[PDB]
């Protein structure tokens, strides 16, 4: 893989609380969940906590309003900050005063960001990471979806202001906008309708969020690092290579060879389901858009020794059949969904998705609090006057009416406690079952 030198953001370490502050891309998306999934499977003995701090519709103004009650309240040790998709504006780019509109939106955005910047400079023990938002895809050919011309240029201006602020203040910086635009160009060559940025050029689908996770992990220096790399010479019966693992009990019976494999990490599991209303591409689609398998999901098994065709079994489960030329080349166990460790990784992936859904309900509650109740002087009131004002407003506020049932549940402290306890149930299960166990690998010749 091609990274390690690509590191601009320090990796998370044991006990970190990494909060991803953002807008709807963060709020309703999974890139942060996919990043946590990486840390859960690759560093199973290094527990961390990731927090979704996105609220749909936010600009730098809204993010700044809610820093105390929604972001700093989570006590981040590492805080990622992304914005601009809403700040940049939309329809007026195709109107008469596009240039002046872009300039006014850029100025308003950095004015609000400066309020946030001042707050970040005052934090005593929080690593600040400016993360340039994913782009508005201006070049994709989407049916019946009209392009807001040059909107991503205002976005890029905001991201440059972020970069230079990070330089001044001693903060780290990484950018999704440029690499994702580049990938958009590259795959739009193959199909003009391809995009990392979803059906509306704005909100990435699961594949886009997995690319975003990939890029953030590469910025943390994980690109090019293998899940495990083992090389067994069949005629010598010792392991030539045992990177990220322990090889032992190499045995030869007739022309079959078997050994014990104890990995330090599990493979990265990829969801193949297009999850979400209107979703069309899965997390797994990431493999066709970036070198994800090669740079970050390589669990390489190389057996140089006798030749012919062999059947690979792990813990007595048939994985597939390969010629020993392929085996001597090396095969990627992380692409073989039938391995027991991949099934274990998938278990963790499903637990993590359940957790992500619970967290989203907390994000809906946060919208109720900062997108409605704060302006009514009722932030965190969670009382009868809160109920009264919400009732007075639901007939003229479609979004608030859609969340009244959820708010009637989540306004109770005891329910927020119980649902947090549920998230902790899932997180504890993940960090209980994510330890690789000794796996019995067999190459049976056919």
TrEMBL record:
The keyword Signal applies. GO terms for molecular function: phosphatidylcholine lysophospholipase activity. InterPro entries: Ester_Hydrolysis_Enzymes, SGNH_hydro, SGNH_hydro_sf. Residues 20-209 form the SGNH hydrolase-type esterase domain. The keyword Signal applies. Gene3D superfamilies: SGNH hydrolase (3.40.50.1110). Keywords: Signal. Pfam families: Lipase_GDSL_2. PANTHER family: SGNH HYDROLASE-TYPE ESTERASE DOMAIN-CONTAINING PROTEIN (PTHR30383:SF5), THIOESTERASE 1/PROTEASE 1/LYSOPHOSPHOLIPASE L1 (PTHR30383). This is Lipolytic enzyme, G-D-S-L family.
């Amino acid at each position: 893989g091609a990274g390690a030198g690509a590191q601009t953001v320090k990796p998370f370490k044991e006990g970190d609380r990494a909060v991803f502050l953002g807008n709807s891309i963060t709020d309703g998306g999974r890139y942060h969940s996919f990043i946590w999934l990486y840390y859960m499977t690759r560093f199973p003995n290094m527990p961390i906590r990731v927090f979704n701090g996105g609220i749909g519709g936010d600009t730098a103004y809204d993010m700044n309003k809610r820093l105390d009650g929604d972001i700093f309240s989570k006590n981040p040790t590492v805080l990622m900050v992304t914005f601009g998709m809403n700040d940049s504006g939309y329809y007026e780019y195709n109107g008469d005063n596009a240039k002046e509109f872009g300039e006014q939106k850029y100025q308003e955005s950095i004015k609000n960001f400066q309020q946030m910047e001042k707050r970040f400079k005052e934090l005593p023990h929080t690593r600040i990471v400016m993360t340039g938002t994913s782009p508005y895809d201006e070049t994709a050919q989407i049916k019946d979806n009209t392009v807001f011309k040059k909107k991503n240029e205002t976005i890029k201006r905001i991201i440059e202001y972020q970069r230079e602020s990070a330089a001044r203040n001693g903060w780290e910086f990484t950018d999704w906008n440029a690499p994702m635009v580049a990938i958009n160009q590259e795959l739009q060559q193959k199909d003009p309708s391809f995009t990392l940025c979803g059906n509306d050029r704005i909100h990435p689908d699961n594949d886009g969020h997995m690319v975003m996770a990939y890029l953030f992990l590469k910025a943390q220096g994980f690109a090019g690092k293998d899940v495990a790399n083992m090389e067994i010479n069949a005629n010598k019966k010792q392991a030539v290579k045992a990177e990220g693992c322990t090889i032992s009990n190499i045995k030869k019976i007739g022309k079959d060879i078997s050994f014990d494999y104890l990995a330090e990490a599990l493979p990265y599991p990829l969801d193949t389901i297009a999850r979400g209303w209107g979703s069309k591409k899965s997390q797994a689609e990431v493999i066709k858009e970036v070198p994800f398998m090669e740079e970050m999901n390589t669990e390489l098994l190389k057996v140089t020794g006798l030749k012919g065709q062999y059947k690979l079994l792990i813990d007595d489960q048939e994985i597939g059949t390969w010629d020993a030329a392929d085996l001597a080349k090396g095969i990627n166990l992380a692409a073989e969904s039938k391995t027991p460790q991949y099934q274990q990784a998938l278990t963790i992936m499903h637990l993590n998705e359940y957790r992500w859904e619970l967290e989203r309900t907390f994000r809906e509650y946060a919208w109720c609090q900062f997108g409605f109740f704060q302006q009514k002087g009722l932030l965190f009131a969670n009382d009868r006057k809160a109920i009264e004002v919400m009732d007075e407003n639901v007939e003229k506020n479609m979004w608030l009416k859609g969340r009244r049932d959820l708010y009637s549940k989540m306004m109770f402290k005891e329910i927020r406690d119980a649902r947090e306890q549920e998230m902790d149930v899932l997180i504890s299960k993940i960090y209980e079952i994510n330890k690789p166990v000794v796996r019995k690998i067999v190459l049976r010749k056919i």
